[PDB]
Amino acid sequence: AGKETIRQYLKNEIKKKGRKAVIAW
């Protein structure tokens, strides 16, 4: 869980694909 909030949840294991969750959805 991202309770380690950096578990990789800070990256969603994707950075949502590169923080794309805005660097490009």
Side-chain angles (χ1 to χ4, degrees):
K3 288 173 188 317
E4 323 303 273
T5 324
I6 265 277
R7 191 214 75 199
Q8 271 161 134
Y9 191 93
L10 180 137
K11 302 168 56 161
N12 184 32
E13 203 179 70
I14 2 184
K15 299 193 278 173
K16 288 274 190 184
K17 205 176 192 305
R19 269 275 183 171
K20 278 199 185 54
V22 56
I23 305 305
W25 300 92

